[PDB]
Paper text:
The [name] fusion protein F is a trimeric class I fusion protein that is initially synthesized as a precursor (F0) and requires proteolytic activation by a host cell protease to generate the metastable, fusion-competent prefusion conformation of F. [name] F is considered the main target of the neutralizing antibody response against [name] infection. The [name] genome encodes three membrane proteins: the small hydrophobic (SH), the attachment (G), and the fusion (F) protein. [name] F is highly conserved among [name] sublineages and is indispensable for [name] infection. [name] F is a class I fusion protein that structurally resembles the F protein of respiratory syncytial virus (RSV). F of these two viruses exists in at least two distinct conformations, the prefusion (Pre-F) and the post-fusion (Post-F) state. [name] Pre-F is derived from its precursor F0 by cleavage at a single site to generate a homotrimer composed of three disulfide-linked F1-F2 protomers. Here, we describe the isolation and characterization of a llama-derived sdAb ([name]) that neutralizes [name] A and B strains and selectively binds to [name] F in the prefusion conformation.
Author numbering:
A (entry chain B): 1 to 9, 11 to 29, 37 to 59, 62 to 72, 74 to 111, 111A, 111B, 111C, ...
B (entry chain A): 1 to 9, 11 to 30, 35 to 59, 62 to 72, 74 to 111, 111A, 111B, 112B, ...
C (entry chain F): 19 to 93, 116 to 428
Write the structure that this text describes.
Amino acid sequence: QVQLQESGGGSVQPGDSLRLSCAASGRTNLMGWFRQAPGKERDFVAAIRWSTRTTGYADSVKGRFSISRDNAKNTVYLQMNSLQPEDTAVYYCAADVGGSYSSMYYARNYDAWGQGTQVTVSS
Amino acid sequence: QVQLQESGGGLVQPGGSLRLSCAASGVSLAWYAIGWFRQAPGKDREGISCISASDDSTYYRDSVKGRVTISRDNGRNTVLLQMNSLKPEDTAVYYCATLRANYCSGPPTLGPYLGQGTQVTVS
Amino acid sequence: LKESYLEESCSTITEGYLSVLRTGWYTNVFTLEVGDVENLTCADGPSLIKTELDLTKSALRELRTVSADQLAREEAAVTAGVAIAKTIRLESEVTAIKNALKKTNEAVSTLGNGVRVLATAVRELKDFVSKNLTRAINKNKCDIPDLKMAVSFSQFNRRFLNVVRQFSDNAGITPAISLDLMTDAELARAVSNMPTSAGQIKLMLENRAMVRRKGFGILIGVYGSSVIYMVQLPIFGVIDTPCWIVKAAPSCSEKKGNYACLLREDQGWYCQNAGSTVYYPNEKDCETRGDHVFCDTAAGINVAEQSKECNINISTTNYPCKVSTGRHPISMVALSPLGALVACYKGVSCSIGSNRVGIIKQLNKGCSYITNQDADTVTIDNTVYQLS
Ligand SMILES: *[C@@H]1O[C@H](CO)[C@@H](O)[C@H](O)[C@H]1NC(C)=O
């Protein structure tokens, strides 16, 4: 399996923007970002699959965030614009070693997970 | 698998009423999204009514809206279509059917199972 | 089965399947009677009866220790099972179950929690030990001239030994129900006693293997010479409701050179669990038996009714249909229950062919739907898929 290293979080204020990065110890096909907020459950933010070379976002985030990938570096970047108090959560990077296709919108299809990165919006 | 059978049709005078029924031998249609379509002489086959599986929401085409009512009968095992104030334009063979993806919303889309039909004539 | 091809999203919905969904768990408590084998002694040295009796006693002691470990450790399926097992372990419940089976080998018991379980008794080994072996072993001599006695001991303690071995190799909770925890006839009797209507019981009796597969067992404990355990069997209360499978491929268009590709991310199985639509993403979560589809209620995900509309208008505003977008077309084959979706784009030569005549037709670029009646094989370059 692959180990994923995340980065880029912070404590930002309403209306501002951040950028998160996630690199992989090996080859990744489906690579994306979920987020679990304090007291809530883990939800899909956005992912990219290279087998199909397609990208998907959640409805809550579409229009604000953007996801990009570097295949050579097995890296994925996530720009997060117009961040509001409701985007305050621990964002986890997820990945799949590769192979069979499966929905990006569901965590069970990812087998690699990072420790998380805090994003806190206030004042 | 599922054999839909329609009953309750026949001859009526203008303004008369009718109670068509859709049943499935050995299968409860309780959680089937059901639809009533009709084939009129000279015209194309149109879906006039349907009832949903989640909350029993209904759809009626303006041709019949207000003059028909779709509901669930016989312990929710059959589907009933009551019809009042019948016009000569209603003369047609009425079929009961299951809907695509078990979904009823707007003009119904035919599904896996269709009945043989019941004639409704208005002198 | 009816398979409909959706051009808007280059997808397929196959419909007509009849559901079989788990709605509960039925508990069959078993009391296996071993008898007073621990009051018998063979002092004459090696013998067949002696080895069998030593295996039996060693098994009873091993199961006592395993139960001790299980209870020192227990201080959704296995959760509910362990809960009802802690309920049964109360002395009142054990005595009530052993009294309910005082004059019968099968009874319907009711616990303090109102839970309605089925109690069964396996008394063959106790009968052999009390009505035969105990008289044969006179003055601690087991090297008797009656070999049928040793053969019978083996025959009547095989099940007890196997039960002990399975419960010890799994620390009190077996992942599967063997024929030694519950036979086929006992399984049928348990099914007949489940709290569901006649149709579900008929369907489950006609598909007993599916019931056994999804069941497990929990050791209750060794109370005297009586080994008490329980088998949890799945109760399929929802049947003959719609199920459908959605399978998709990349749908790509071109505008002034710039490509636009869309791929549905909601592919998988769907079933109408009594007013709630359930989605199973991985096709290994459901198994097709004839016209019926057995889906594991675990690993299911409730989805809104409006999600269905993605099969009518993928661009609907009444629900955020799960799709992935892109600009680089990928050629792909997605096999559907009654055919195949073929997305063919630049740089790939796609074709359909037969097993008797070979190639039938080169496919045009775009998304095509091939039926198992039109062709037997689909081909993308050197990769060949066989249709059903
Ligand atoms: C068990 O005992 C009964 C009589 O009590 C006898 O008829 C039967 O043969 C015995 N079984 C064996 C296996 O010895």
